[PDB]
Design a protein around this ligand. Structure first.
Ligand SMILES: CC(=O)N[C@@H]1[C@@H](O)[C@H](O)[C@@H](CO)O[C@H]1O
Ligand SMILES: CC(=O)N[C@@H]1[C@@H](O)[C@H](O)[C@@H](CO)O[C@H]1O
Ligand SMILES: *[P@](C)(=O)OC1CCCCC1
Ligand SMILES: *[P@](C)(=O)OC1CCCCC1
Lengths: 533, 533
């Protein structure tokens, strides 16, 4: 036996594997059960802690992907397939992964915990782009990632009911974090130095743990990549959550009490059957909108993320936030008229106006007119190229940039130390068209150091870039400050006034002001006032 | 006696006076009565044609100025005194003036008709800045200017009543235009080539004559200087007009039941006491708002000016329209918090926000916040300089630039040939502070060729500038095209798409696009929608 690959956690005995990396060996414990399988009667229920086991559990490979919709928009296309499940689909999916240096650290080392994105309807910790072996070897930290239930299985909610209270996917995340607190020391990790980081729904998830007191004690620092809990897609109201749940039940033939009977009938439905009707419960044709997301019910979230952010005391907290250069482009091909990866998507004025109602769904005609006014260049109101970028800006600002900027601003103003970035490098291996620029989710591979993989064909500069980004992230994990303890350009904190952030690209850091200040003033300050009247 | 200074019009015989000009003599006949004195029982009533007289009317000096408020903000200050009455006040004020070449033309010459501005509460044809002697000598045209009733005497309205129907000041102008048709040929003028031109309220008057069929056949071309009939200050609702008329009666000790009794009591009051209470009938503290203005009652204007503009077929119309570089600055010192001509007026954001409610009166809080959104640089939200210029822009865009832009765009799109300018020269003699830039109304002196007066201290290049401006204006009056017909840079027509206009200053013509297109999209396209819901 190899003693380095043997670890005892509270649950019992584990056996891991020795992974080869370009920089040396790392220990990996993949597919550690942290909850009882949420199958049968446990579907829609909060996760129960994994009961003790005798003997040795082989934590030697990634476990199943939580059942989810599989993207079919561009079959065979690398840009899309990379996000699809690389393991079999199963409701038995509550497992987490631990990467640690080989040999195991003798002194407590900082812990990085990854929460994948996927719009709360998809994603998995097993995706190649989330391979934590490179971070751990390069920066000498411990990395943890977990699976959490998505779609209806994770976020279907009939609020008030105990058979499906909602937010159980977030509770999956919380249980994993508690597991880290109790067990990461056995791998040489420091439970007093834990940094959460996520992207898309993962970033929104990270933010919700910040705003929920039982979660807040389980970590110390946070990184939010291209996402925020206060995004117009990240949460849903109780009434709308209930409406979507009953609509899904109705679509699959469903049909104690009313809620108990309805969930009981839902539990008899095959997992794939639920998935097949998932998208049909959205109130209108839209982009960047997901059926089953965290619900604001007074429990996990005592109030809306907006209210909690504005009323929060964030002294003693360091956060790292940021966006990619083109947050809106990716989702445009999923329904905006005239958009495709296969053409330049040079849309008309009429397609632009129609795209606005899709990109900004469920708002008044007045609100839509306000969007058009702000994003129209009235000296060139019908230029196809400008209209394409404008709609990208609309979707990107509305869903990502301005929610992130709002969070960054309020957190900084209320005690937190904040660092902000804009990721502006377009990967040489990117398979999406040029007009999409740097799309959402494409900074991740550099943060995880994927270009260091010899099997892949990134440039030497990109490998340098990846190493620099891993350094920033790890420095922040260790000290709450991405800067290194000296002749390089510095990363100034983000404040509500100066609004300074840095550009992340092959070039050295460049300090800039304002996260689309003019645009986000519309979304964060004016538009809410308009929606109230 | 000189036969050139003797003219017989329909009402009888006139005696004129020879005037001196640096380029030779001109003939002038000042203080020609065109209406019966609107005094006593004729106050508030439409003008009646001047009854024929025996003997010779002395037309060698300007007649009385119509009763009006006299500005006392900066006593002795040239910047304000130049606009104050320079003859005695009287209700017996309905006289007009004709300037002709000396000797009187023996063939039909194009006629220019000036309508003074003054916000409908002030102004006079006798002001030095409106001296027509230079235009008429240099460009060999016949210039006519008339006095019209202002304030309550011109525009007090009890809609539906015959004792005070409103818009009689506009009817004064129309009667003068009818007088021109019947008599201008006796001076050598061509009644088939009459060009209306005015500034501020004068421009708004010109626009209203454009939109009123009985006035439309009295002239052929129009020039609108820094004003439009669709400006938020240029017209008033029937209900609000009645309220203001009623409030004035109360303030001067008149009964409010009958409209008849109310007006009869008003007629007993000296002219000065009506003037003394004029400003106090405004609904709130404000800037660029005037108590008694034209009323939309279905008679003179059968609909709102904007509605008439949108429904109109304007083929066969040529209009010359334009603005000064800083339309907002002048008014700011008349009640906007923190503003004065004697200091730099570097206001705080608190004063800016307060100034917005003053500059955009009688709108909902939501409308106000929308203004604040658009005119705030959210990277520099509290910069005193930027805030001063921003509020100037608010007042200027809202009251002048955007109403003019809307007028220009709709006319051009519906058949009219439009020429647009922005006047960007600050006179060397300007007594207003430098921060005010090129204020409203200070292009007039250049158009009237006042710099050619040797006794004034304009530069040599300013004289040449004045001469070029007079040529543009006279070219337009003659041909409907300001362009010299020409290797010099051409002045292109304004269109709704290209939105081309020229800059007027010491430098040659420069063609630019957009009359503040971004800002005016807010005022003209979005804000009306917001007020509706
Ligand atoms: C994706 C990658 O990195 N490699 C693939 C591999 O099939 C091939 O051997 C290589 C040659 O450069 O090009 C491509
Ligand atoms: C137009 C205006 O606001 N005037 C103000 C005055 O009210 C104020 O008292 C003064 C000194 O405080 O500064 C100036
Ligand atoms: P988000 C709204 O979940 O979408 C992106 C998240 C990162 C991975 C690509 C999709
Ligand atoms: P208008 C809006 O009546 O303003 C006048 C103020 C005096 C100078 C001419 C324009």
């Amino acid at each position: 036996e190899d003693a380095e690959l043997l670890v005892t956690v509270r649950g019992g005995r584990l056996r891991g594997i020795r992974l080869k990396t370009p920089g040396g060996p790392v220990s990996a414990f993949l597919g550690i059960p942290f909850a009882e399988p949420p199958m049968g009667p446990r579907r829609f229920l909060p996760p129960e802690p994994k009961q003790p086991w005798s003997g040795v559990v082989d934590a030697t490979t990634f476990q199943s992907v939580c059942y989810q919709y599989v993207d079919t928009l561009y079959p065979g296309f690398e840009g899309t397939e990379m996000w699809n499940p690389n393991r079999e689909l199963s409701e038995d999916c509550l497992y987490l992964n631990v990467w640690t240096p080989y040999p195991r650290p003798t002194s407590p080392t900082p812990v990085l915990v990854w929460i994948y994105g996927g719009g709360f309807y998809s994603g998995a910790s097993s995706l190649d782009v989330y391979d934590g072996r490179f971070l751990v070897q390069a920066e000498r930290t411990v990395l943890v990632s977990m699976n959490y239930r998505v779609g209806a299985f994770g976020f279907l909610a009939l609020p008030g009911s105990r058979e499906a209270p909602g937010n159980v996917g977030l509770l999956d995340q919380r249980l994993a974090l508690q597991w880290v607190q109790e067990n990461v020391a056995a791998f040489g990790g420091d439970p007093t130095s834990v940094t959460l980081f996520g992207e898309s729904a993962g970033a929104a998830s990270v933010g919700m743990h910040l705003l929920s007191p039982p979660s807040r004690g389980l970590f110390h620092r946070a990184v939010l990549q291209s996402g925020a809990p206060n995004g117009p897609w990240a949460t849903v109201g109780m009434g709308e959550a209930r409406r979507r749940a009953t609509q899904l039940a109705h679509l699959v033939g469903c049909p104690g009490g009313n809620d108990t009977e309805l969930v009981a009938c839902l539990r008899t439905r095959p997992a794939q059957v639920l998935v097949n009707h998932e998208w049909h419960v959205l109130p209108q044709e839209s982009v960047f909108r997901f059926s089953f997301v965290p619900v604001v019910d007074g429990d996990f979230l005592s109030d809306t993320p907006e209210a909690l952010i504005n009323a929060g005391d964030f002294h003693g907290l360091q956060v790292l936030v940021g966006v990619v250069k083109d947050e809106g482009s990716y989702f445009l091909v999923y329904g905006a008229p005239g958009f495709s990866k296969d053409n330049e998507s040079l849309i008309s004025r009429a397609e632009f106006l129609a795209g606005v109602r899709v990109g900004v769904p469920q708002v008044s005609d007045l609100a839509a007119e306000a969007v058009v006014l702000h994003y129209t260049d009235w000296l060139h109101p019908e230029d196809p190229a400008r209209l394409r970028e404008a709609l990208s800006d609309v979707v990107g600002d509305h869903n990502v940039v301005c929610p992130v900027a709002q969070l960054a601003g309020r957190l900084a103003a209320q005690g937190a130390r904040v660092y902000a970035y804009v990721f502006e490098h377009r990967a040489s291996t990117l398979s999406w068209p040029l007009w999409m620029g740097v799309p959402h989710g494409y900074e991740i591979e550099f943060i995880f150091g994927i270009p260091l993989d010899p099997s892949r064909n990134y440039t030497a500069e990109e490998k340098i870039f990846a190493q620099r980004l891993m350094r920033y992230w790890a420095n922040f994990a260790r000290t709450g400050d991405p800067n290194e303890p000296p002749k390089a350009p510095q990363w100034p904190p983000y404040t509500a006034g100066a609004q300074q952030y840095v550009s992340l690209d092959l070039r050295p850091l460049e300090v800039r002001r304002g996260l689309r200040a003019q645009a986000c003033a519309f979304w964060n300050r004016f538009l809410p006032k308009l929606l109230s009247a």
